[PDB]
Structure formats: C-alpha cells, structure tokens
RNA sequence: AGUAGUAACAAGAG
RNA sequence: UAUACCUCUGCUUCUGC
C-alpha cells in the first residue's frame, strides 16, 4: 500500500516558501478553565526565583515584604537573571545618545508638550481597568466616573479642570489623604400606589452610602494588579497569566510610553512602533544594509533569538533610572512626573484571582475558596503542584490575600521602553576591540542579532559576548527557542525571511469569517478582508474568488439569510421567500434579504447598498433606508466607521470600513444576566446619564461629532444656547408671544 | 433503547424532534453530574473536600 | 459517564 | 418554611499593553 506522508512535501518546496502549512489556524486556540490562581502564584514564585539572590526588605509605606535584585551579585549559571547593574545600563544608554545625537530631549519635549494638551477623557479609551472602589474589573469610562465622584468627596477637583496633569497632581496627593471616603449603593424599600389587592407595590430603591478606608488600605488598593489567565493564545501547550492595571496608574503610563515611542520611531534597529508593509519596508532594507556592508571573503550570520522570562526578570527601578537619564535636560516638574509610573511599579501589589475550588468526589460537592482563606485549610487537602507552591508564596503573602510583587512586570505596559533598553544592547555593537561587529532588530521580547567577523568561530565568540551583555540588563536570551544560521533566512515576530520577507498566509486565515458586528457592516469587513490580503498576503484570485464564495456561506447560515429562491427552511426565509416574491428588482436585494451576491474581484473596495442602489425598487430602498427606521440608534462616530478586529499576534486594533447606514445595521440586546446580581443599581445610573447626554446632544448637535469643551457647568450652556434660540426664534418669528412667555418662565425657573 | 428511541422520535408523524427525558437519556445525557456548590465555611470545616 | 487536560463544565439564581 | 410543575438568566463570578 501507498504510505502518504504530508512533510514530503518539503523535499520539493522548501520551508519559508510553503511555512503557511505549518501553522493549525483552522483548529481551535486554547482556552483556560475555572481559576488562574494556581498560574498567578507561579509567576509570583518564578518572579523572587530570580531575584531571590538581591536584598530583601520591609516597605515602612505598605509593610509588605519587597525584593530589589538592580546591583546585586552577578549570576554564575545560565538561569534567569534580574540582576542588572545600574552603571551597564547608563553606559548602553549614553552609547545610545552619542550614536544617536540630542534624540533624548527632543523625544522628551515632544512628550512633555503633548501631556499639556492631553484631556482627562484619553483615560477612557481604554479596556477592562481595575476599579480601586469597588476591587473588582470594569470599563475605563465608569472605573474613571467613579474615581471623579469618589475623588469629589475626599475634595480633589483636578479632574474639572480638563487636563490630566491636574487630575495626575490629584492621584498621588490621594494617597496622602488619611481616609478615601466613596459612594457605595444599598437598597431600601419604598411603598408606591398601585392597583393591587392592598392597593400599592414595594419597589427596592437604590441609595448611596458614604463607606470610608483607611490611609494604608487605600494606598494598597492604588498600586493593587488583579490577574487573570490568556485566553485563545496560540502556539503554546501550558496556559500563563496577564494583570489589569488601576486609574491611578494608567495615567504615567500612557505619557512614559509616549516618550518611549518617540525614541523608537526614531531609533532604526526596532520593529515598534511601526507595523504592516512600513515594518517590512524598514527590516528589508535593514537587512541589505546589514548584508550589503559586511567585510568582503567573511561571514555575515543571523540569530533567530527570543528571550525567555521577559517580563518576569526586567525591574521598575532600571525603568526608573532610563526615564531619569532621557529627561536630563527637561524641566524639574517633568522629571518627576515621568519617575511616578516606575516608582507605583516598583512597590507594586498582586491580586491572586479567585482561589481553588475543593471538592469531595463521594459526597459530590464543590466550594471556593477565597485568596484570603488560602491558609484557613491546612495544606494536606491542597495537591502536591498547589501545596510547594502556597508554601514558597508564604513569605510574600499578605493577610488580605494578595502578594507583594516588588520586582518583575507582571502586567508589562512598558512595551515602547522595553525594546529600548533591548537596543540600547544592539547599539553597543563590540566588547574589548575584538574582530566582530554585532547588531540586530528589537520587539518588546522578541529580537533578531546579524554578526559580521572573519570566520564563524569569531561570529559564535561575538554572539557569546551580546547574551553576557544582555544578562546585566536583566536580558535573558532563551538557549532553547533561540538559535543561529548564515545570513539569507531568519525568523522576526512570526515574520519569515528567505532572501526576502515570504508570503504567511495562514496567520491572518481566522479573520477571513463573519466578524460579528451586524449584517451590513460584516459584509464591507468580509470583502475588504479579501482585498487586502490580495494586496498584502499574496491570496491569488482563485483563492480570492473562493474566499467570497466561502464568506457569503458562513454569511448567510449565520444570520440565516439564504436566497428567496432557494426553499431553505427556517422563521427569517419565511419572510425572505415572500420578499423575493413581491420584489421586481431582485437583483437589487441585499444578499441578508435572500438576494443574490454579485462581489468578484474587481468590486470588493464598493459597499453593497451602493452596487445595488439602482437595481433596487423604489419601496425597497426606501423601506431598506427609512431615515427614521428604529433599528440603527444613535450611532457614534466610533459606530459607524471602525470595528475591533483581534489578530493572532499583537494587541486588538479597530480597523476601518465602508457600508451606508440602513435596516441591516442594527445593534443586539444587552447582556441581561445584570438583572439577577445587585449590579442591577447601574442600570438606572447609565439611563440618568443617558437622558442628560441625550438632551445636551439635542442642544449641541456637533457634540456627537467634535469632543465639546467648557470647565463650566453643564446645565450653565444648554440654559443659555435655549435662552438664545427662544429668543432669535421670536425675533424672527418662528416663536408666538404665547410660547416666549412660557419658555422665559420655564428658563426663569433655572 | 436511546437509538431505538431516536429511529422512533425521528420516524414518526410528529413535527417535534424532542426526545422524553428517560432514565437512559439521562444516563447517556450525564443528568445532575454537576457538583453541589456549598458555603467556603462548611467546606473548610469539612476535610473529606480536598 | 463524557467532554476535557494542570481546572473546569456535566445549569445557575430568587 | 411557603408561593415555585413558578419566575428571571446564557460573555457581566474578574479577558491586560
């Protein structure tokens, strides 16, 4: 019998070339379940393993137990190491500003000027932020709400004032008041008429309370992390955790960040911040540079490297002392501003999540048990894995049941200055006038060194010297998953090179299906998919053709819109079957009302409702694209254009499409599950502030779509513009005398 | 008897494809296997929950 | 049982 | 206790840069 094996297939096309094959994106990502204590606590553990061998003390702030690795005894074993010495990094950071001239304070200023017109309002656009009132995750908009209100209690109106140094200036003197009082909702009950048997109804009214804490307490909950496990990270066996970050944090964060990006949009040896064809335009080119100057009769060589333990082994206070360094010549007020986001994450604070579930398997019962509670089981009943682990944690643990993180960057964030510490090691370039000359590409953990010497004994020699190097950053270049080859193919960020960047199209295949927006807007997504990977990815027009025939399937079992001639059965076709019937014009149906789908190769860049506007029926249209149709709502400028989109690679990036707003572009109910916990009080708080947004928007129609801006009341301007417009309106003449007097009076009110 | 019951369910003259929830289909279903769920209290005081 | 795989679901709540 | 062969829920019992 004839024993077909897949690899064969490599004996005629090499690797880089036919690489999509080797990638299982048709499969299923892993996921995680129940708790990720059990993996928090080992990046707790693995995060001291490595700085176990520094100086340990107690913080007199919080009275944690902390850990500080920075100028502490170098490392005699290829284990990971934190142990940076201050001096290497200031050397590799002046190596930096002499290669690259007068960057630092121009990077600075650039920052600097920015954080001045920075609005409070940038802290909202954001994702799921740790919310300090309530110790549980929310989103940015209201965990930010609820620190301007709680903040307004303990008297700090920074916020008002619009700009986000204020409202900075207030977070870190919060910390010096002696209590934090905020607002949190009871209920009571409340007797209303009605028509019952004894005519009334009790109705569980929602009050706020004014519940306080003490100075330590809120101080903890400031620099507190909660953590969780990574969902649907491909490519990996074994699950790790990630940490959400406070409020008061995220503000330094965003501005040191921003310096950073500054820095390496103009450094050359880093992917970040650039992406897509710009990144692959820099690293060819690069790559050419670093190939064409080589020593003629030598050996240029590239290692395919990656860093192991990242996050895990790079400290706060070598951060602390970059920023300090890059903002030399910048004002005092600067300095200390930039040195806040190090320092919080310096004596930072870890959540274990929820706990550890135990059961009995003959009873057949389950229980939670609480991070705090963690030590209220003797530790027989805990399993070996749990058991070693909760008594290494031990030292760390704090009674509230959270664990001090002194060290690490569990959350990471510093991804910008991060790589720039991993170039200022690229940029050194040579150690002792030896007969190499190294210099390679960062991103974040991810890292491509070229060599170029006299033979490779030389090369192996020069790479030997980059990992010493990089161990005094606290770089720990990973021996397994890093290895090294003769320039012409290397691997960087999941990209491929093979005498040039080869086409992976297996990387961006998960994207190609119904994105799960609506209808209308699913469809421009689909096919602009399509287009740009014709463009980008190198997707053939067969496989293009295909890729249209396969979406419009997916498409219309999804939202079970099949053709009106075809007899599918189904409550939608029902209908579908009738329109096609009553319709002249099917051609000008959308394929979501069961018409047919005319998109091919050429038309992907046009909306639907535009290809078919004039095939439509004059009732269809006008029924498909009712001005005032109650499906669509108050769209957002954010509504109608963008959409999330989350590649198997780099952070969730809104991409942009073209679709008109009709029936099909509705929105889907809210998760109802609110309505059984005691959350439900937020509901009425969010149609409070719905009515009044609503209401402004009706006085201030450009509201929806340029930001408004006034430090004054909010009331003060639509009092005065309905003043205005009352009165132009009857100077004019549009408003009676029988009107004016009773808008004057209603306004008198106010 | 689940197979027989589902040549039966899916032969006969009614619109519905819904299956009786017997003692079979629910053995073969898994029914009521979920755990108990009790107080952290009670659990940490009882140390057959391991 | 089974899914599944370092921990869960095999319904939850009033 | 009882209403409860009733009622509500299906991402909202923690999904970061």
Redo the contacts with the bound molecule.
């Keep these: 019998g004839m024993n077909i094996n897949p690899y064969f297939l490599f004996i005629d096309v090499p690797i880089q070339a036919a690489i999509s094959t080797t990638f299982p994106y048709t499969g299923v990502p892993?996921?995680?379940?129940?708790?990720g204590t059990?993996?928090t606590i080992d990046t707790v553990i693995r995060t001291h393993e490595y700085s176990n061998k520094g100086k340990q003390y107690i913080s007199d702030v919080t009275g944690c137990t902390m850990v500080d690795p920075t100028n502490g005894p170098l490392p005699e074993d290829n284990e990971p190491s934190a142990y940076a010495q201050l001096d290497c990094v200031l050397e590799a950071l002046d190596r930096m500003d002499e290669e690259h001239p007068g960057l630092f304070q121009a990077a600075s200023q650039n920052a600097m000027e920015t954080l001045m017109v920075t609005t409070v309002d940038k802290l909202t656009q954001?994702?799921?932020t740790f919310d300090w009132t309530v110790c549980?995750?929310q989103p940015a908009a209201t965990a930010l709400n609820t620190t301007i209100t709680s903040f307004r209690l303990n008297d700090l109106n920074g916020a008002d004032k619009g700009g986000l140094i204020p409202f900075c200036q207030d977070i870190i003197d919060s910390l010096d008041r002696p209590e934090m009082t905020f607002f949190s909702v009871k209920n009571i009950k409340k007797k209303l008429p009605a028509k019952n048997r004894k005519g009334f109804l009790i109705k569980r009214i929602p009050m706020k309370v004014k519940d306080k804490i003490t100075k330590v307490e809120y101080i903890k909950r400031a620099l507190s992390l909660?953590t969780?496990?990574?969902?649907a990270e491909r490519g990996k066996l074994?699950?790790r955790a990630?940490?959400?970050?406070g409020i008061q944090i995220r503000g330094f964060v965003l501005v040191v960040?921003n310096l950073a990006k500054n820095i390496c949009e103009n450094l050359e040896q880093s992917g970040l911040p650039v992406g897509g064809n710009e990144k692959k335009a820099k690293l060819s080119n690069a790559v050419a540079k670093m190939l064409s100057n080589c020593p003629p009769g030598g050996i240029s060589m590239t290692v395919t490297g990656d860093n192991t333990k990242w996050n895990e082994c790079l400290n706060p206070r070598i951060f602390l002392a970059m920023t300090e360094r890059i903002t030399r010549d910048s004002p005092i007020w600067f300095r200390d501003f930039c040195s806040i986001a190090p320092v919080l994450f310096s004596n930072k604070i870890a959540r274990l999540?929820?706990g550890?579930?135990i059961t009995s398997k003959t009873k057949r019962l389950?229980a939670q048990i609480p991070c705090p509670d963690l030590f209220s089981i003797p530790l027989e009943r805990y399993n070996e894995?749990?058991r070693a682990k909760l008594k290494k944690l031990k030292p760390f643990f704090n009674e509230e049941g959270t664990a001090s993180l002194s060290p690490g960057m569990m959350?990471?964030?510093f991804?910008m200055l991060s790589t720039v510490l991993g170039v200022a090691a690229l940029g050194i370039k040579n150690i002792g006038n030896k007969e190499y000359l190294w210099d390679g590409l960062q991103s974040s953990d991810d890292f491509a060194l070229f060599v170029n010497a006299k033979d490779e004994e030389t090369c192996m020699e020069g790479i030997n010297d980059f990992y010493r190097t990089c161990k005094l950053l606290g770089i720990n270049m990973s021996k397994k998953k890093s290895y090294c080859n003769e320039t012409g193919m290397f691997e960087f960020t999941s990209m491929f090179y093979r005498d040039g960047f080869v086409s992976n199209f297996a990387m961006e295949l998960p994207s190609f299906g119904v994105a799960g927006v609506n209808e209308s807007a699913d469809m421009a997504i689909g096919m602009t998919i399509i287009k740009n990977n014709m463009i980008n990815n190198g997707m053939g027009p067969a496989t293009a053709q295909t890729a249209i025939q396969l979406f419009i399937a997916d498409y219309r079992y999804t939202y079970k819109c099949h053709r009106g001639d075809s007899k599918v059965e189904g409550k939608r076709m029902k209908i579908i079957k009738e329109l096609w019937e009553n319709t002249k014009g099917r051609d000008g149906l959308l394929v979501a009302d069961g018409g047919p789908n005319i998109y091919n190769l050429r038309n992907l860049h046009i909306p639907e409702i535009v290809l078919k506007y004039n095939l439509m029926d004059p009732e269809y249209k006008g029924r498909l694209l009712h001005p005032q149709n109650p499906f669509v709502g108050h769209l957002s400028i954010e509504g109608i254009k963008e959409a999330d989109i989350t590649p198997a690679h780099g952070?969730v990036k809104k991409m942009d499409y073209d679709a008109v707003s009709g029936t099909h572009s509705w929105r889907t109910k809210?998760?109802?599950?609110?309505?059984?916990?005691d959350?439900r009080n937020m509901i009425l708080e969010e149609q409070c502030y719905a009515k009044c947004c609503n209401l402004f928007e009706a006085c201030f129609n450009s509201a929806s779509y340029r930001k408004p801006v006034g430090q004054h009341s909010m009331l003060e301007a639509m009092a005065h513009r309905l003043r205005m417009d009352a009165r132009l309106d009857y100077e004019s003449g549009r408003m009676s005398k029988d009107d004016f007097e009773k808008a004057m009076a209603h306004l008198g009110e106010i | 008897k689940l197979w027989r019951d589902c040549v039966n369910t899916i032969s006969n003259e009614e619109m519905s494809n819904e299956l009786q929830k017997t003692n079979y289909a629910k053995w073969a279903?898994?029914?009521?296997?979920?755990?108990?769920?009790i107080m952290k209290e009670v659990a940490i005081d009882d140390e057959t929950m391991c």
């Design positions: 892993p996921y995680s379940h129940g708790t059990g993996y954001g994702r799921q549980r995750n909660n969780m496990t990574k969902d074994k699950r990630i940490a959400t970050a960040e999540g929820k550890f579930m389950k894995e749990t959350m990471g964030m991804n952070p809210r998760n109802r599950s609110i309505l059984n916990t959350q | 279903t898994g029914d009521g296997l979920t755990y108990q769920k």
